[PDB]
Subunit: 325 residues, 4 copies
């Protein structure tokens, strides 16, 4: 049966779409490294991750062809063999295209779709609500994760929006950014598992330990031991009341991320979202993300250095926390 | 042979993609009214327009299926029979998809593509330049019109960008908005026919009468006599030095547009770009644009009233200027 | 001797600058109701508040004359008679004016200044840091509360800024808005008592109960019992581990604030910051804030209704929580 | 008696507030170089400028003390001796402070005030309109130049605002930025002399030669011959129909300004508005602007280089056009 919020716990990792060496060239047509895809999936399951998300911004939902996406999702589904939940990404420029893609990828065997909103024209609240209702009506078997990124999708995903989404049974989770309004969003949307970023999980879990049981991780693509440790230590802390160890892991994570954003700026990061994440993963050496598909294959050198430093820092964390596991 | 800037003169009208009555429903699959398409094309040629653009924002490039686009462009090309230049629109989320679509629509018989930039991730200057170079390399037979809309495409199309575009022979024109930096852009980009909006044509033509010989018009979809008269009166004024009559037409146009934008605000208009343009055309009664494809089918009633008033004002202008022609 | 972060605990209320009936007129010259000022101060001390802040945005730091500010602060200082800490506000267009005002108001007997940054030209990080260092050097006896409002002061008060402020001994507290980055800011700035807004206190206190012991309140000007109850119930929760009662108070507060912002929008609220706060306090009836000084005396009627509803809601909370005290 | 739009023609130059060597120090109290002020004024009148504006953003309206402003304006007024119109700047955080300052500086002998809006809280249209009406009621002898800078003052000065300002007789001119909506603003506000930036004067004058007869210039502080030449050549072109020479001057000006903005970006320039203008003038060597008053005395080195290059370019233009003038 379909996933619910009750089924969403622990560490959910967002994987890249590994690319072949020629992927930056507009002439290339089959740019997904399907063997590297399979290898990453198995490594994540083996590390003990609770679920897998894919095909967000740095996963290059925007730049893959439809044939590449089908092949990618097929490979993932055959590798996973039902062992963990998997969400693909079907964000597109309009409702009909989203529905067409969501239908095919759910049929191939994904459990759900991580879904932003069409972003050529900026959506208002009623448009966005109707969009998610439309997709849920059209594809009732699919679980939905709201991909709540205002930089990418222009819409700001405000409080009343969450109240409306809690009425759609298919909407079970959200990839959430800043936790500034999380206390309230939880109240407005009781039926949604809100996933903070890993760096914010410690804080969010302390705010509401009953509701905040899961988080999403990009840093896991540099070695997942850090995320696994955080998950485990937060479960222990909720039981014992001793938060010191979880706090120390959380502080390490924030430090590893400290050079990732160009000049500290989320909006400047968002212009180079794809290249910076991929350069980071490449530097950490746990997986081979490969070059970026056009048009987003140019990143200033200064910024790359920051991303590479972050990668090396996360790889160091993976080494440290692998021993403590 | 391929169009150049020298071939771009006079009144270029941007047509909507007429929709069938069920087009707001995500279930509908063939939502283009192809007969209304053909009728509009013939009416525009008969009014004396110099060229046709299509499939921008209000033309619903974003919300049409690929099958609907081929049928639309086929219909237009068969109706036009080579009598005027025609540009389709192929803006998409990535370079490979843009190239695939531009190839097919040029093969069907469009002369060129009105092309924005991929907008999921905000582009920087080098990314955008490389994007247009890539499309021009991939599809050298196609003329390109830069669709320079920062609200839609996030990128701001700055001065150095125009300098780069003037080096691409395929780039022959630009749908341009505010004329604040037009004097300089003309200097930086000698090989491009910059098309101001009809309301700005009078001013732009006075700044540089040798270079500013053409403009784009949405208001023509409410009755093209106003645009034809402006074109004709500006040709006369350049010759005689008497600008009074062109100025009076230009002032009428600005007044007709004065209620279109919600609270005077371009960014608020841009959220409802599609519904407001279509509601305006519907109110004017010269053509039947029809309902908007999902997800952009909800517009606040206050704003619609302003768009409808604008439509009625343009229809009045069409009546007045039809007599003077 | 000078306040430190260790001295800042509990409920800190931000008072308005009560105005006489002619205060909206640019001709009026002594528009502070000094008796109402004294009455509010005594009522707040009698309610048990831990400290008083004044002369931020809605306190009309911007629109008071220098004579009005001296009389206001004199009245407050003579009413307080040393019983609680008091911070005035000395934000101005430049460093020398800030220093001149801070010197005089500290001499009159304020303990410190709630200080934003000059905002005609937008400050960068080094400029802002040097500004606060300059004021602290010039007026070493004054405690400083950073007034971290990006809408008012344009500067965004980013993470590295807090690291720098923790090196200035005079900087002991901050009026802080969204708590999205609070976990990290606390780490970067060990010597600062960060004051969340009352609505965010519950969440912030759960994140870091050792560091988050105080908050600021505007809602207390509608009746302070709600803030006093929250303070008291959070001290018990920290001891017992039972957060249910604190959560219920916090939820009531969020509901009372729910109609305050025009269309939910902080930036739209910020255009009418002064009129909306004053209209709210006037509606609650616990104090008489009076009309706004020019130029900020015009607020759309729709928005006023929302502010008045909020006022009535806070007055209801004051009634309820007065009984439970 | 009071200036009207009919009196506003030609080249209006915006002067800095020259500072003494210790002016970056918060301890310093009389940081205006009054002799350099007088020297600049006389040089501008001698160059043939039509009017002088002062105390905008780079003029450091924000960072001068009240005593400094009075001495500055006194010096200017006594140097000018009625020979050209002069506008001071009285933008402040509220209406009463603006009125107090405008009264005193008009009494000292300025003809008018270049006035933005209070910017702690962002103004809406009705607030802004009422603000300019109050200052005009309070100080009816003062001419007003609207300082229409959205970066500094947050308000965007939209079309309906101009319609309202054209009803205030005291409002006679505007320091205007982008000319994208100028055609319309002229129609909405018949009684205002809109001053485009010098780089946009060529274009604006061609759009509406009857209404666009004046412009404002910061580049003149690097040597005013360029602005004087542009004024003169545009007068000639309106009469002859030959615009080639005016266009060439305008193109030179745009090139001289091309490195001024950090990364081409008006908003990034606006963070360093004061330091960059002063560094540019210092590099050109026609006047000594001096250091910036606190807090705005720190500018990244990369950006300074661009401003200095711009200064040298404008100084080169001044040399070239000084020869062509006579």
């Amino acid at each position: 049966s379909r996933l619910t919020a009750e089924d969403i716990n622990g560490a959910w990792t967002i994987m890249p779409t590994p690319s072949t060496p020629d992927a930056s060239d507009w002439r290339s047509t089959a740019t997904v490294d399907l063997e590297e895809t399979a290898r990453i999936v198995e490594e994540l399951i083996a590390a003990g991750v609770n679920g897998i998300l894919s095909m967000g911004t740095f996963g290059e939902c925007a730049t893959l062809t439809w044939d590449e996406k089908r092949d990618y999702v097929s490979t993932i589904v055959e590798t996973i063999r039902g062992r963990v939940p998997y969400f693909c990404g079907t964000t597109a420029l309009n409702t009909r295209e989203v529905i067409r893609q969501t239908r095919e990828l759910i049929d191939i065997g994904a459990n759900g779709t991580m879904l932003g909103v069409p972003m050529w024209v900026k959506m208002d609240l009623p448009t966005a609500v109707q969009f998610y209702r439309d997709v849920a009506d059209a594809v009732p078997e699919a679980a939905i994760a709201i991909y709540a990124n205002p930089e990418a999708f222009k819409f700001d995903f405000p409080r009343p929006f969450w109240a409306e989404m809690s009425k759609i049974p298919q909407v079970v989770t959200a990839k959430y950014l800043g936790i500034g309004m999380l206390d309230l969003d939880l109240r407005l949307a009781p039926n949604i598992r809100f996933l903070p970023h890993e760096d914010d999980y410690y804080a969010a879990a302390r705010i509401n330990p009953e509701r905040i049981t899961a988080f999403w991780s990009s840093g896991a693509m540099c070695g997942p031991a850090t995320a696994i440790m955080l998950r485990d230590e937060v479960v222990r802390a909720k039981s014992t009341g001793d938060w010191a160890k979880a706090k120390a892991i959380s502080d390490d994570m924030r430090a590893a991320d400290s050079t990732l954003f160009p000049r500290g700026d989320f909006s400047e990061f968002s212009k180079y979202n794809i290249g910076l994440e991929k350069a980071r993963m490449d530097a950490a050496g746990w997986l081979k993300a490969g070059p970026c598909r056009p048009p987003y294959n140019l990143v200033p050198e200064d910024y790359l250095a920051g991303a590479q430093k972050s990668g090396k820092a996360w790889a160091a964390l993976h080494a440290k926390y692998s021993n403590e596991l």
